[PDB]
Design a protein around this nucleic acid. Structure first.
Ligand SMILES: [Mg+2]
Ligand SMILES: [Mg+2]
Ligand SMILES: [Mg+2]
Ligand SMILES: [Mg+2]
Ligand SMILES: [Mg+2]
Ligand SMILES: [Mg+2]
Ligand SMILES: [Mg+2]
Ligand SMILES: [Mg+2]
Ligand SMILES: [Mg+2]
Ligand SMILES: [Mg+2]
Ligand SMILES: [Mg+2]
Ligand SMILES: [Mg+2]
Ligand SMILES: [Mg+2]
Ligand SMILES: [Mg+2]
Ligand SMILES: [Mg+2]
Ligand SMILES: [Mg+2]
Ligand SMILES: [Mg+2]
Ligand SMILES: [Mg+2]
Ligand SMILES: [Mg+2]
Ligand SMILES: [Mg+2]
Ligand SMILES: [Mg+2]
Ligand SMILES: [Mg+2]
Ligand SMILES: [Mg+2]
Ligand SMILES: [Mg+2]
Ligand SMILES: [Mg+2]
Ligand SMILES: [Zn+2]
Lengths: 176, 38, 125, 136, 134, 94
RNA sequence: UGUCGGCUCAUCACAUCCUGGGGCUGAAGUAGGUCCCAAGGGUAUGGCUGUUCGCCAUUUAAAGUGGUACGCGAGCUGGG
RNA sequence: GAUGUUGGCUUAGAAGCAGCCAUCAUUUAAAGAAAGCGUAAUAGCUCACUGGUCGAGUCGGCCUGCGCGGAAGAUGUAAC
């Protein structure tokens, strides 16, 4: 509601193709496509996008609000892009990047390797830190989380894969 | 995960949610306040 | 909080010291400790200066009480006003040295004679 | 734990609990715990409850108990056939009809009283509400 | 940038002073005996507050300020310890001249506008520890 | 000052009263003085929020009945046993 | 409408004894406590007692709790 | 998110934050002798409270209508 009624400004060079409920947004950082929920109606005016409900639905305004956040992030994606930062806490935790595969040495027996899906690229400015760029917010977030899945950061020394920003609280050993 | 038929807010950081037709209580602060109805 | 009656009385107090005051200085109050602010309140009661931080849309109602109406665009941003009820000056000479001492905030726009003084020319006062 | 000092008769007919309550109003304290539902209060229940709201007020203000468990209930023990008389007297109860006032209270902050009464009602079998004494 | 309250001509016990401002890089004996050289003038038995200012080079400058409202109210009512039950149990007495002496000492140490504001803050610390103002 | 609007009751008895109470209206009476009694009906809500003040019981109010006011006091009032409700009000002519 | 227990044969449940997934812990690890999900398979030999039960010995990943005319005598036994 | 101030009591230490009692006054736009984490005690971290940006509705009770959880068993769905 209060979301759907703040329209999204489409900056120059940012291309909006509306076919039915199917949006395709294109730009310098790449291309993205999303089918909106059917309750929503989205219109192109000047260069801006405005979202409002359609009749025959109850939830029109929640669906709308979501549509707005979606396409807003879709705009940010193909302009600026997206970045997620992770870092590995603890001894002998290494990260390598070969093509789209990430090599994780996490202290298991076997090497742990993470295939990255299309539209996502990664780099390690260190041994202990990974960064991903990508257009798609949901996707890069997911990938990030799957990396966090392998070793989740822990209650005591903090060891694990954490987001660079992420607050980590520990606790002390049970005394004796 | 305290699983019980009366679920409540145990502090100011506990936030109630209905996920998939279950009422749970989620806390950022205190893992011990994590509850599900049942 | 503040009731409408609260706001009304306070608009009457700001309008009342505004009528009685010789000269005023509007400034940014942001990013400074209450220690240095009680320091400029001591340096305020010592210079005859009446110090205030007041709501903006309240100060449009109090400054509509004339002749400070040239200041109603100086109320966008956090507002700390120094009314010198005793002497003109001693607010405008105290604020530039307090903002150069702290190197925080601004001290944006003054008012004297019924006109507004731009930020680099407040050295007139 | 309340119970009649001495009685005319030792035992009683089961009787019915029908119709509504008398003493619907708060005549002593500023606040009262009224019963919405209809049921029998054992002495145990009333005592436990009075305790609960006595902890709750830190022994301040004042508490009245408007109800009394005057009617004796009997039970035959296990493994005993029917007949051979009426069962032995187990415990005492107070018949409660919708709209009785179980406890009264005053000399306390309202908020605290609503609280203490919630804690008191946790111990009671029947539906209850909070109420304030009125002028007339 | 630390603060402590140290007895008049005294310094260098282990639990009150040395560790507290000694984990901050401060030389301990210069603080100790330049503070007993400054506060030799404070009467024996009064804790006097000292504000220690440390810099990136560990050379410090401390402003020794006037003895507390509570310590000058211990001494101006004659007493030793104030009340364990303030304004319920009352432990001593000060006429308005002592409120005003303690509030000239603290006129050097307050935020107050007038000696009535400093006399009223010493009035507040006079109601805090139980003492009566007479 | 409190002003209560009312209508004259065309019916009586237990049935009338309980249909009244079902419709979110309730029966009351006006007696006292030289005159005859006058039975009237009221809106439960208005009055329930009106006696939600204390003065209602200590004061002279007015009742508008068929264009015509009467000035009265609150005499006694019977409330439903557990519900935030009013069964009835005795009004005594002021 | 054949009564306890053993024997032979089972079969169902899940309120799970083990193995499987998981949250919380006063969870350093090892080893646990408690709760959630799960019935696929697994689930001891003896001494004593007519025994079920129990107690004891020594096992095992564990020696689950119940239903089935306290399953099963036109299948066996007959100690009770 | 201030001064008196580490309020006094007590403690090897209590400094808003073991515990006991008071809980005043100052500069105030506002700042509890402090609502929680924190320390050997501090420091360190938010909160109450207020100024700014924002721009039109928001808060939580009362009374009711219909629904959700609470809700596990044995041949086979088997509680229209
Ligand atoms: Mg799921
Ligand atoms: Mg009868
Ligand atoms: Mg009767
Ligand atoms: Mg009749
Ligand atoms: Mg009838
Ligand atoms: Mg289960
Ligand atoms: Mg497990
Ligand atoms: Mg351990
Ligand atoms: Mg477990
Ligand atoms: Mg099995
Ligand atoms: Mg299979
Ligand atoms: Mg054998
Ligand atoms: Mg055996
Ligand atoms: Mg043998
Ligand atoms: Mg044998
Ligand atoms: Mg059998
Ligand atoms: Mg069996
Ligand atoms: Mg047989
Ligand atoms: Mg047979
Ligand atoms: Mg035989
Ligand atoms: Mg409203
Ligand atoms: Mg149900
Ligand atoms: Mg179940
Ligand atoms: Mg089944
Ligand atoms: Mg049908
Ligand atoms: Zn919580």
């Amino acid at each position: 509601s209060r979301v759907a009624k703040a329209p999204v400004v489409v900056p120059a060079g940012v291309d909006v193709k509306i076919n039915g409920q199917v949006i395709t947004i294109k730009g310098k950082n790449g291309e993205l496509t999303r089918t909106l929920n059917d309750a929503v109606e989205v219109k192109h005016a000047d260069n801006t996008l405005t979202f409002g409900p359609r009749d025959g639905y109850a939830d029109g305004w929640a669906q709308a609000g979501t549509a707005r956040a979606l396409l807003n992030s879709m705009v940010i994606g193909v302009t600026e892009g997206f970045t997620k930062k992770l870092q590995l806490v603890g001894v002998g935790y290494r990260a390598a990047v070969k093509g789209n595969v990430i090599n994780l040495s996490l202290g298991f027996s076997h090497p742990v390797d993470h295939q990255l899906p299309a539209g996502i690229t990664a780099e390690c400015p260190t041994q202990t830190e990974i960064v991903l760029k990508g257009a798609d917010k949901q996707v890069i977030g997911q990938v990030a989380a799957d990396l966090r899945a392998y070793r989740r950061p822990e209650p005591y020394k903090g060891k694990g894969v954490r987001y660079a920003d992420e607050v980590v609280r520990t606790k002390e050993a049970k005394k004796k | 995960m305290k699983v019980r038929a009366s679920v409540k807010k145990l502090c100011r950081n506990c936030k109630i949610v209905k996920r998939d037709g279950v009422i749970r209580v989620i806390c950022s602060a205190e893992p011990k306040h994590k509850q599900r109805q049942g | 909080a503040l009731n409408l009656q609260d706001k009304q009385a306070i608009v009457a107090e700001v309008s009342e010291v505004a009528k009685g005051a010789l000269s005023a200085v509007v400034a940014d109050s942001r990013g400074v400790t209450v220690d240095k602010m009680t320091e400029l309140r001591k340096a305020g009661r010592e210079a005859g200066v009446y110090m205030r931080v007041v709501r903006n849309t309240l100060l449009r109602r109090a400054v509509e009480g004339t002749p400070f109406e040239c200041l109603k665009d100086a109320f966008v941003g956090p507002t700390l006003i120094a009314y010198v009820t005793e002497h003109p000056g001693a607010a405008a000479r105290l604020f530039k040295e307090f903002a150069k001492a702290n190197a925080k905030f601004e001290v944006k726009a003054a008012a004297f004679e019924g006109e507004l003084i731009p930020a680099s020319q407040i050295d007139r006062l | 734990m309340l119970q009649p000092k001495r009685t005319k008769f030792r035992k009683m007919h089961k009787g019915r609990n029908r119709g509504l309550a008398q003493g619907t109003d708060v005549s002593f304290g500023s606040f009262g715990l009224k019963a919405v539902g209809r049921g029998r209060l054992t002495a145990r229940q009333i005592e436990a409850a009075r305790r609960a709201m006595t902890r709750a007020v830190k022994r301040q203000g004042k508490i009245w108990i408007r109800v009394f468990p005057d009617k004796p209930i009997t039970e035959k023990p296990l493994a005993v056939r029917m007949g051979k008389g009426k069962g032995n007297v187990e415990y005492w109860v107070a018949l409660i009809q919708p709209g009785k006032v179980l406890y009264e209270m005053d000399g306390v902050p309202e908020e605290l009283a609503r609280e203490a009464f919630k804690l008191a009602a946790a111990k009671l079998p029947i539906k209850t509400t909070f109420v304030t004494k009125t002028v007339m | 940038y630390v603060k402590l309250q140290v007895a008049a001509g005294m310094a260098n016990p282990s639990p009150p002073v040395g560790p507290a401002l000694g984990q901050q890089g401060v030389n301990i004996m210069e603080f100790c005996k330049a503070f007993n050289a400054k506060t030799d003038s404070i009467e024996k038995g009064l804790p006097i507050p000292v504000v220690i200012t440390v810099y990136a080079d560990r050379s410090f400058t401390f402003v020794t300020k006037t003895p507390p409202a509570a310590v000058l109210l211990k001494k101006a009512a004659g007493i030793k310890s104030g009340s364990g039950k303030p304004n319920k149990d009352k432990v001593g007495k000060i006429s308005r001249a002592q409120l005003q002496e303690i509030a000239q000492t603290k006129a050097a140490d307050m935020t107050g506008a007038d000696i009535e504001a400093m006399t009223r803050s010493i009035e507040g610390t006079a109601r805090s520890m139980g003492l009566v103002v007479e | 000052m409190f002003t209560i609007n009312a209508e004259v009751r065309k019916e009586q008895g237990k049935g009338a009263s309980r249909r009244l109470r079902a419709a979110n209206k309730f029966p009351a009476i006006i007696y006292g003085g030289k005159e005859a009694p006058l039975a009237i009906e009221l809106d439960h809500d208005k009055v329930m929020n009106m006696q939600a003040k204390a003065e209602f019981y200590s004061e002279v109010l007015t009742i508008v009945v068929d264009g015509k006011e009467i000035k009265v006091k609150a005499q006694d009032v019977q409330r439903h046993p557990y519900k935030p409700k009013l069964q009835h009000i005795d009004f005594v002519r002021a």
